[PDB]
Amino acid sequence: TSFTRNIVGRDGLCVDVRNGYDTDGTPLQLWPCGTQRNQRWTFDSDDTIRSMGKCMTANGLNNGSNIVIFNCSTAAENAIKWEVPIDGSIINPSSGLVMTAPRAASRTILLLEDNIYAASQGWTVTNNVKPIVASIVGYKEMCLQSNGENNGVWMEDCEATSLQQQWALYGDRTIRVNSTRGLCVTTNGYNSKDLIIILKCQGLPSQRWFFNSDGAIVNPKSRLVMDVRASNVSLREIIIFPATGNPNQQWVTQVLP
Numbered sequence: 325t326s327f328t329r330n331i332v333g334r335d336g337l338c339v340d341v342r343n344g345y346d347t348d349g350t351p352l353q354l355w356p357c358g359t360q361r362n363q364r365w366t367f368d369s370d371d372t373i374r375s376m377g378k379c380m381t382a383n384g385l386n387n388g389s390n391i392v393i394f395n396c397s398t399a400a401e402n403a404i405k406w407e408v409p410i411d412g413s414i415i416n417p418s419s420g421l422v423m424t425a426p427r428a429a430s431r432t433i434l435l436l437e438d439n440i441y442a443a444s445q446g447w448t449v450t451n452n453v454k455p456i457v458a459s460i461v462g463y464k465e466m467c468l469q470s471n472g473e474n475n476g477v478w479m480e481d482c483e484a485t486s487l488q489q490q491w492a493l494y495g496d497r498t499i500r501v502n503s504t505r506g507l508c509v510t511t512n513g514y515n516s517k518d519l520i521i522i523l524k525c526q527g528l529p530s531q532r533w534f535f536n537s538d539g540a541i542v543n544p545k546s547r548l549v550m551d552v553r554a555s556n557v558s559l560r561e562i563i564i565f566p567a568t569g570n571p572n573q574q575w576v577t578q579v580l581p
């Protein structure tokens with residue numbers, strides 16, 4: 325079977341065939357999301373991803389290789405097969421390299437690169453091309469709240485009127501301050517007990533998050549998950565820590581009006 329969607333990534337821009345051209349070798353880029361046909365990608369059972377009747381194609385299979393559109397019958401088979409890991413990567417199975425947006429700007433050309441679990445390598449396959457805006461409810465049924473750039477995130481009692489409890493869940497798998505969308509939830513290191521803060525979005529692995537089926541919020545590079553330190557909300561510290569399933573690591577998203 326097949327179905328068609330946009331592909332949203334870095335800074336909420338979309339995977340777009342450059343200029344709408346369908347000539348073999350036309351690179352893929354970031355561009356503001358829209359309905360144009362060169363942003364509509366059809367996913368088939370054969371592991372191809374197609375726009376304008378042609379296939380997303382690795383124009384080479386080394387670090388830094390370009391990703392292009394190319395005739396599906398004449399391209400190399402191992403260059404047109406893709407899988408979509410649950411954490412939001414888009415991977416070429418033959419090479420193991422993943423789709424990457426090396427810069428945030430529109431017209432940035434997409435490349436295959438070694439997987440470092442960066443936010444530049446996060447994508448979401450969807451027809452809703454706007455970030456989802458939600459409260460993130462956790463331990464003691466409190467809400468995750470931001471407190472300014474460079475400051476910690478922490479738990480507060482949930483308030484419909486607290487804008488700092490409002491999070492934009494971007495397609496690149498970042499968690500952004502909804503009223504200041506250039507700022508991202510960021511782990512301040514990849515080791516256990518490292519603090520979670522707000523920092524300018526820079527596409528980093530420290531800024532990538534995965535909402536898994538167990539109710540954890542996982543940082544893929546470290547493997548560690550968001551944790552209310554010591555189960556003590558009055559410490560006003562959220563850390564990364566190995567997944568335990570304990571209440572201080574359980575979260576849900578609740579969409580906002």
Ligand SMILES: *[C@@H]1O[C@H](CO)[C@@H](O[C@@H]2O[C@H](CO)[C@@H](O)[C@H](O)[C@H]2NC(C)=O)[C@H](O[C@@H]2O[C@@H](C)[C@@H](O)[C@@H](O)[C@@H]2O)[C@H]1NC(C)=O
Pocket residue numbers: 387388437438
């Ligand atoms: C795969 O390609 C990447 C993009 O070119 C490399 O990362 C970039 O490496 C540059 C040095 O050659 C460096 O100035 C860029 O800032 C960096 N971009 C970022 C932020 O990832 C990557 O190179 C590896 O990682 C970088 C950061 C350095 O540590 C290099 O020594 C590494 O080789 C390439 N990866 C590999 C394994 O070839």
Ligand SMILES: *[C@@H]1O[C@H](CO)[C@@H](O[C@@H]2O[C@H](CO)[C@@H](O)[C@H](O)[C@H]2NC(C)=O)[C@H](O[C@@H]2O[C@@H](C)[C@@H](O)[C@@H](O)[C@@H]2O)[C@H]1NC(C)=O
Pocket residue numbers: 377378395396397398
């Ligand atoms: C992908 O390349 C194929 C091989 O070059 C194209 O098929 C060829 O299209 C030629 C020019 O239209 C035509 O003379 C031949 O009939 C045909 N050759 C083969 C091997 O099938 C293909 O074109 C599409 O598929 C063919 C079968 C027809 O249905 C065309 O109308 C299609 O455009 C190329 N695919 C695309 C999307 O360009």
Ligand SMILES: *[C@@H]1O[C@H](CO)[C@@H](O[C@@H]2O[C@H](CO)[C@@H](O)[C@H](O)[C@H]2NC(C)=O)[C@H](O)[C@H]1NC(C)=O
Pocket residue numbers: 457490502503580581
């Ligand atoms: C989250 O932030 C967004 C972006 O600033 C807010 O969305 C704007 O809201 C106004 C009022 O409805 C609209 O006129 C704009 O079109 C919106 N802009 C965008 C880019 O969507 C939003 O209200 C904030 N809060 C919530 C709950 O989403």
Ligand SMILES: CC(=O)N[C@H]1[C@@H](OC[C@H](N)C(=O)O)O[C@H](CO)[C@H](O)[C@@H]1O
Pocket residue numbers: 340341342343344345355360361362
């Ligand atoms: C419809 C289409 O092909 N759109 C393209 C094209 O857009 C240029 C202007 N803005 C237009 O709407 O016609 O080129 C940009 C930049 O390369 C994108 O590829 C866009 O999707």
Ligand SMILES: *[C@@H]1O[C@H](CO)[C@@H](O)[C@H](O)[C@H]1NC(C)=O
Pocket residue numbers: 556557558559
């Ligand atoms: C929780 O943190 C506050 C601030 O450090 C501290 O005063 C309090 O004793 C802590 N609670 C427990 C049970 O350790």
